[PDB]
From Swiss-Prot, chain A:
Residues 1-17 are annotated as: Fusion peptide 2. Disulfide bonds join C2-C13. Changing N18K: In strain: Omicron/BA.1. The chain holds residues 839 to 888 of 1273 of the full protein. This is Spike protein S2'. Subunit of the fusion protein that is processed upon entry into the host cell. Mediates fusion of the virion and cellular membranes by functioning as a class I viral fusion protein. Contains a viral fusion peptide that is unmasked after S2 cleavage. This cleavage can occur at the cell membrane by host TMPRSS2 or during endocytosis by host CSTL. In either case, this triggers an extensive and irreversible conformational change that leads to fusion of the viral envelope with the cellular cytoplasmic membrane, releasing viral genomic RNA into the host cell cytoplasm.
Curated annotation (Swiss-Prot), chain B:
Binds to host ACE2. RBD also interacts with the N-linked glycan on 'Asn-90' of ACE2. Cleavage of S generates a polybasic C-terminal sequence on S1 that binds to host Neuropilin-1 (NRP1) and Neuropilin-2 (NRP2) receptors. Interacts with host integrin alpha-5/beta-1 (ITGA5:ITGB1) and with ACE2 in complex with integrin alpha-5/beta-1 (ITGA5:ITGB1). May interact via cytoplasmic c-terminus with M protein. May interact (via N-terminus) with host bilirubin and biliverdin, thereby preventing antibody binding to the SARS-CoV-2 spike NTD via an allosteric mechanism. Attaches the virion to the cell membrane by interacting with host receptor, initiating the infection. The major receptor is host ACE2. When S2/S2' has been cleaved, binding to the receptor triggers direct fusion at the cell membrane. When S2/S2' has not been cleaved, binding to the receptor results in internalization of the virus by endocytosis using host TFRC and GRM2 and leading to fusion of the virion membrane with the host endosomal membrane. Alternatively, may use NRP1/NRP2 and integrin as entry receptors. It comes from Severe acute respiratory syndrome coronavirus 2. The gene is S. Changing T5K: In strain: Omicron/BA.1. This is Spike protein S1.
Length: 50, 49
């Protein structure tokens, strides 16, 4: 029944009949992007001091 | 359905079955669509939670 974006609604239908499920990761990709941006800004502005 | 058993939610679908084909199948040998023997309509099968 279509696929809205990647994980917009998805009907929570990662299930496939005979007991086989896929679990979502703890950290969404936005948090990882924020982590990388923080590390990169820190290394540009402060060097290795931070 | 005509000797084909299972369990799940039946819903209306928009598949295009050939005139002689009876039931569809996924890429993992699982059924996903069935012809209704009395009235020729395509029913999709989705497992309940
Ligand atoms: C759980 O199922 C219900 C079904 O009632 C979903 O409700 C849908 O909500 C969206 C957003 O408002 C509507 O556009 C749909 O029309 C609703 N469904 C129906 C059948 O009316 C609900 O979104 C589902 N929850 C999740 C997390 O997928
Ligand atoms: C098998 O199912 C019924 C058995 O009577 C028939 O199909 C319906 O028949 C009624 C009246 O007998 C009609 O009003 C409906 O319009 C029919 N439905 C369809 C989908 O044609 C008929 O004998 C057989 N139907 C089919 C499709 O083979």
């Amino acid at each position: 029944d279509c696929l809205g974006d990647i994980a917009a609604r998805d009907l929570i239908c990662a299930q496939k009949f005979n007991g086989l499920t896929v679990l979502p990761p703890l950290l969404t990709d936005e948090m990882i992007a924020q982590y990388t941006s923080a590390l990169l800004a820190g290394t540009i502005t402060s060097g290795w001091t931070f | 359905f005509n000797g084909l058993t299972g369990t799940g939610v039946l819903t209306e679908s928009n598949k295009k079955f050939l005139p002689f084909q009876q039931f569809g199948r996924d890429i993992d040998d699982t059924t996903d669509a069935v012809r209704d023997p009395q009235t020729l309509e395509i029913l999709d099968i989705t497992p309940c939670s």
